[PDB]
Design a protein around this ligand. Structure first.
Ligand SMILES: NC(=O)c1ccc[n+]([C@@H]2O[C@H](COP(=O)([O-])OP(=O)(O)OC[C@H]3O[C@@H](n4cnc5c(N)ncnc54)[C@H](O)[C@@H]3O)[C@@H](O)[C@H]2O)c1
Ligand SMILES: NC(=O)c1ccc[n+]([C@@H]2O[C@H](COP(=O)([O-])OP(=O)(O)OC[C@H]3O[C@@H](n4cnc5c(N)ncnc54)[C@H](O)[C@@H]3O)[C@@H](O)[C@H]2O)c1
Ligand SMILES: NC(=O)c1ccc[n+]([C@@H]2O[C@H](COP(=O)([O-])OP(=O)(O)OC[C@H]3O[C@@H](n4cnc5c(N)ncnc54)[C@H](O)[C@@H]3O)[C@@H](O)[C@H]2O)c1
Ligand SMILES: NC(=O)c1ccc[n+]([C@@H]2O[C@H](COP(=O)([O-])OP(=O)(O)OC[C@H]3O[C@@H](n4cnc5c(N)ncnc54)[C@H](O)[C@@H]3O)[C@@H](O)[C@H]2O)c1
Lengths: 436, 440, 439, 437
């Protein structure tokens, strides 16, 4: 009838390293008003920081970047071949943001320049926004507050709903989708999610096989997808046709993923009761007045005349929490690459690291040798280092570039200069630093 | 020794005799009048009882109401329809009044009670709708959503993260830890907020909230301050200049309680001085009585012009309980309450009447009759009634007094169709009688 | 369409302080407590003004009859039998406290016919039984008892074979009542899947699942525990066919009733290597006192065979035998008597009509409470309400339990003079069983 | 004035390449001391040939058996000395299916390029559950109750019998076991305090206490989850028992040495300690046996076993089917990844070295596993020998006098393999070389 047998095998934080210095104080340039957390991390390392609140014109940048060891940018400052080619001293680039398209990664890598970003530091800020907007759409808060500001009193309960017992449809169950799932359940929503992949539910959310089943059974539909050919305009006339009468659409994902004119048709036809958009096919480049208009997007005027539409200026990760933790994530990443040669989490460089050295390891030196990925190079380097015990050593390749880290013992101030000069003279060399 | 090991200090729902369906000795079918667009849930409950329902979406003029209420057994109103002696005095048949709302002031309770007319309301069925609103507004204030959406609608793009905060790790100060305060406490903890609460009573925390001894400790340590208090002399203008002075630089004020409890001009000063970073108000010292355009202006409240000038103020027209869920559960709560008073004489939860009920009778208790005798609260009346019913075993009996009115319910066995008519006529002829119904 | 959802803190009570009522013709109240009732009961009774006589033992029928002549309330446990023979001499007895679950040691029907209200504590033992079952699940899983018996005789036997970690295992709970449900939550916390069978549909706590047949439970369970009442349908409800339906190497725990398991079948199943272990707290026949040669083949024919077996925990009805349980029995039952003696509250009584009224405000000077227990016949309310008719009855509640009935009335504007009159008149009525006045 | 301030701050996923050794005929595994069937299944599913025994082996038959063996699994009883490891031509790695490694000459094994693995933490849940069972059992005197009725005594007693809910558990050592116990104990409704020589972040709502003396003062049950160090030696003795509550309880499933049994016995005799559960004693029998636990082994045995409400267990804290089976998986997996990929992470005698697996489609990539003497010049030689191929990547680490290089090299055809093996095999510093292709 059965037997008692072995259960299936299941499936805290607690409280001395050597401070390494380069043979060459380092100079950091921070643009586009990076958070003060980044600034404090860099100053506490001894580094000299130059801080600006704006991007710089191509002219002043080329002048500034000549003598700089690390630069922090956001989405606005373009680092092209044109401007990176004058960067004699540049060790690494910090992108205090998710995007890296504003940097010529291929070129940066070929000069031995490591690039870091913060891809996931914004998840919580977007999830909270969507909760706020579910409630705000449910209750038509925006409309109520606009009315009373113009002096109109319109106390309405009709089609104004409580969120408890309603269905949230999450399209894309990723970093943000999943954090949202848990908040939504805590606010008493049933969570369905469609994804092109099978994913393990958090809490008591249920994965649905087709988009059509989600749109059919959902009161609120929210999008948390990347920009791909398949996500392009993936919500359009036929999707809105498949949704419940008086259902709600929220998009804080990508400007392209929803067909705004179809949305506008659906809202006009009383099929969709509300929408919140944080992202649009075309967005201003700077902040300012009459930026959001029919020159930018043809339907801007038509949308601004609809009831119960929340429109936001791409502010999903626009919190002090998000900016400060981007500051820490990226300043830490640079700080460990400059101080230890740690390239883990870089988007353009081979990923390489070694355990820190004890305070007690006098006269150990760390070789950071970026080089062309061809046969013969380790032969040369390990020949040059032959007079010293290599405690340990790690090399990895990323296409046509490669990165060796080596720890060598019994090196006096004299022998360092010798080893630098020899490694500097090698055929395959792209960049060499010694940490001492 | 450092003490001794000694004694520590100290069910789920189960599906578990059918009740007897009790008919009035009134041959006439019951007539329900529902005004002011009571929810369809109420209508359904009444029709399924057999009752005849007349439904209006508006109040009625005093003329048509007096005509209509002559032959009505139960009336449902909301806050608009005033039931005064003037109009209740013509109500021959009226058993009970339903207030499908929190307020009972629209009704002359004292007068209604003296005619044996029981009044019921729904005090608490709006709690969840208010708690959800406050969560929405904490986030909306934290992120300046309203301002962002107003900007982009006029064509201004202003992407700002300065003065924008993730609610996680912030402190919610709840003033009044009642029905709404407590439901808010749980939602706030789930959204990752620390909860403090001040209350003039000691109350057991839900989740991991902590009660604080003084208002001033709450104001000092809170990022968002929300009010969930009644309108009393002590709550009148209890948030003013000195309270805002005690609050954190860049803290937020939410008032969805009573329009008297906050001094709007002091808050306007505090917002102007960059001491308060945002506010959401659902309630005001003076509110329009109808919905309309240019209702919310300086004739009604002097500061309107300045208030609506400010950044990051959410203004709402008393919409805290304005949901379909809230209205529908008001429908069930109040229609059920009337239905049990009409069918069983249950007066528990009534606001103008003694609170009296008895266990239902089993389906198989043939020839048991229930006496519902509303009467003047004076000596001798139980003596009379229990004399009139001495030829019968009283299975059980409950009488309570509320001022000058009192309410006897009695279950009596071994009564045939003959003896019912006798008992009605006798009780109907008594000196203290205000109202008698028999259920069989 | 988007449509309407389906419909879905204790505080210091600032009330007007209640009025403390005293008895009228009574000088003082005498409580007799037998069978070593907890000190919590003693404290509650002394704080009420009552005079307490405390014994650690039952009393011989001789000394008891002498003692209960002049007694207002008696507290017993399971041993002291209160028969017609001994209750017939009880002139003054207002109420009986059973500081335990059982009320069979009392002649309830007789007690009721003399107007004597009986109270018990049915559910104050739940947590003590649930914890015991957790301890025993682990102890059986790991064969602790056997290991410790071995080493005490000097034998070292490190064994891992068919010793298990409870996490991942299935607890089958038969009877999802007060104990069943508390056990459910502890079991899930110790990482067990919980199934439960019950003859009623019941809402699961946590992530337990109710199963439609007993046989599904027995099939899918590693540990089967019973928390069921003693009924004709629970009698030997685990027998050969149930053990046959259980997993090879599954475990049986009975801390419910002595009759619910067939021990000869259990013994067979353990002998046939079908059942790997059992814990019994209850047996069809139990000693009456504690003693050294009590648990033997005279008491139960299979004892020598049962005690022969490996990995069987035998315990002497200690399911509820904790300091916590005894002390909270003390509070529950002493409170219940205290409120019946002081306020006439009969709610939770096992032999009387359930009747109470809201307390009176402190400032209701000259309001008196009539407690009139009487024969459930026509005309008695007529008489009483006649006797009271010179006074406003603020409120009044009468309920009937077969042939006995209980009226409580609050009456205003009564001076010390009119009290004596009203007592004497109610005392003289034909239907009267007992009358007290509180003022 | 104050100021609002910044807060503090499941998916299925390129198949791997299955790498074969260059000069192997079949892999031979020897498993001793009745290793769990989970290990056996993992090895058979790799293709390996498995020989399984339920007992340790005599030194004679072992030396014969280990000549031709690629991997051996032992537990604590088998002793792998220089004497017996010196005959092991083909031995790649040793599996300790247990927490102990002292039964192995680690230093010697390392110097021959023999990697040793264990399962240090596989037992944590089994020990935590035992302590829960024993807290309840001591609280209620279950053992005594069951011993009484078995002798025919009926003794229904509630005195000094307690419910655990509302009682205080003092955990000494908030490690792998301490921390799992913390969560179970809270769920059973105990307050948890813990002392540790390190500051550690509480799970749930447990509170770390500064001194041992505060723990002993405020605790109803004291349980020990520490390693064997000079500081833990007899750390519970007369003065600690003096500091504990009248009628408190002591549980030791840590190490045989950490409690002074004489003082415990005095404290129990004086009615200061109401009960104790011991799983570990300073001296323990060597086999299971019927007269083993006595005054020859520990002078206090006859006195200890006299006492009421003392649970005595035979080191059964990690004696469950679950624990043995997950030791099976942990250690068989560890060997399997070392044999198949050269992964040495979690090894106790060898350097810790690993690389990402290779994609299925990387034909003619070869992995060099070169164990060697930790001296200058060796990487120079090896990287010279390999210089006619692109090194995709390469990792070398040293552990004292031994060191371990892993390299991935591309564009290697069936011919060039034999050349590279022979050259690496001929180098002065070489201790062991395998090629995977
Ligand atoms: N509004 C903002 O300011 C802001 C800020 C941060 C992130 N985002 C954006 O939001 C999106 C989601 O963010 P994330 O970090 O959680 O992403 P993610 O990488 O964690 O997950 C994306 C999910 O989408 C799923 N997916 C991909 N294509 C799909 C399709 N066609 N249909 C359904 N599911 C599909 C993937 O399986 C994955 O689960 C991204 O585009 C991200 O850049 C916006
Ligand atoms: N916005 C709306 O549409 C709407 C809807 C429903 C309720 N409300 C109002 O909001 C309030 C909350 O209603 P509720 O059901 O939660 O009330 P409640 O009676 O359940 O709780 C009120 C709490 O306030 C506390 N309290 C009273 N005076 C206090 C004071 N001076 N300071 C601190 N604590 C004090 C009480 O102890 C109690 O805990 C009421 O005034 C109610 O009328 C508004
Ligand atoms: N061992 C002890 O010292 C001790 C102490 C307390 C209680 N108990 C006994 O344990 C039992 C459980 O106690 P409780 O307070 O939880 O009782 P309870 O009344 O709360 O629960 C009993 C449950 O059994 C269910 N049930 C009844 N007949 C059934 C049947 N034949 N099959 C399955 N389910 C059935 C009922 O529906 C109910 O859910 C009782 O017999 C009680 O006297 C023993
Ligand atoms: N009974 C058994 O069969 C069995 C099974 C497994 C483990 N164990 C033993 O149990 C112990 C705990 O195992 P674990 O995995 O939790 O170990 P662990 O290393 O994870 O934790 C030990 C903890 O003790 C602390 N500690 C060390 N010295 C201390 C001192 N003097 N005072 C207080 N705290 C101190 C450490 O800080 C650490 O947190 C070990 O000794 C282990 O061998 C026994």
């Amino acid at each position: 009838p059965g037997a008692v047998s072995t259960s299936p095998t299941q499936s805290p934080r607690r409280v001395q390293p050597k401070a390494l210095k380069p043979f060459s104080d380092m100079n950091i340039l921070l643009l586009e008003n990076v958070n003060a957390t980044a600034i404090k991390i860099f100053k506490d390392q001894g580094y000299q920081v130059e801080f600006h609140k704006s991007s710089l014109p191509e002219d002043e940048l080329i002048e500034k970047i000549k003598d700089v060891h690390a630069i922090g940018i956001r989405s606005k400052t373009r680092l092209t071949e044109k401007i990176l080619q004058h960067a004699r001293n540049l060790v690494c680039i910090g992108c205090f943001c998710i995007g890296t398209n504003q940097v010529d990664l291929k070129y940066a890598a070929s000069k031995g320049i490591a690039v870091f970003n913060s891809p996931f530091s914004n998840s919580r800020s977007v999830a909270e926004l969507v909760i706020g907007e579910i409630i705000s759409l449910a209750r038509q808060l925006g409309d109520r507050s606009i009315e009373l500001h113009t002096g109109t009193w319109n106390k309405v309960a009709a089609r104004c709903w409580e969120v408890r017992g309603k269905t949230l449809g999450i399209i894309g169950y990723g970093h943000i989708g999943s954090q949202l799932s848990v908040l939504a359940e805590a606010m008493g929503l049933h969570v369905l999610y469609y994804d092109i992949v099978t994913i393990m539910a958090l809490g008591t959310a249920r994965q649905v096989s087709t988009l059509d089943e989600l749109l059919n059974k959902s009161d609120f539909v929210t999008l948390h997808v990347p920009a791909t050919p398949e996500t392009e305009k993936m919500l359009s006339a036929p999707q809105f046709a498949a949704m419940k009468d008086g259902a709600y659409v929220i998009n804080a994902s990508r400007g392209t993923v929803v067909d705004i004119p179809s949305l506008i048709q659906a809202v006009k036809a009383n099929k969709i009761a509300g929408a919140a958009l944080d992202v649009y096919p075309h967005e201003p480049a700077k902040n300012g007045e009459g930026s959001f208009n029919d020159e930018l997007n043809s339907w801007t005027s038509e949308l601004v005349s609809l009831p119960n539409i929340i429109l936001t200026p791409h502010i999903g990760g626009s919190t002090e929490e998000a900016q400060s933790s981007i500051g820490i994530e990226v300043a830490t990443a640079l700080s460990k690459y400059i101080n230890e040669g740690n390239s883990v989490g870089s988007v353009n460089f081979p990923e390489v690291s070694l355990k820190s050295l004890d305070y007690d390891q006098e006269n150990t030196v760390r070789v950071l040798y970026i080089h062309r990925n061809v046969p013969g190079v380790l032969k040369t380097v390990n020949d040059i280092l032959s007079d010293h015990n290599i405690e340990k050593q790690f090399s990895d390749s990323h296409g046509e570039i490669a990165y060796l880290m080596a720890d060598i013992s019994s090196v006096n101030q004299s022998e360092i200069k010798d080893i630098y000069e020899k490694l500097n003279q090698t055929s395959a060399k792209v960049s060499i630093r010694l940490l001492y």
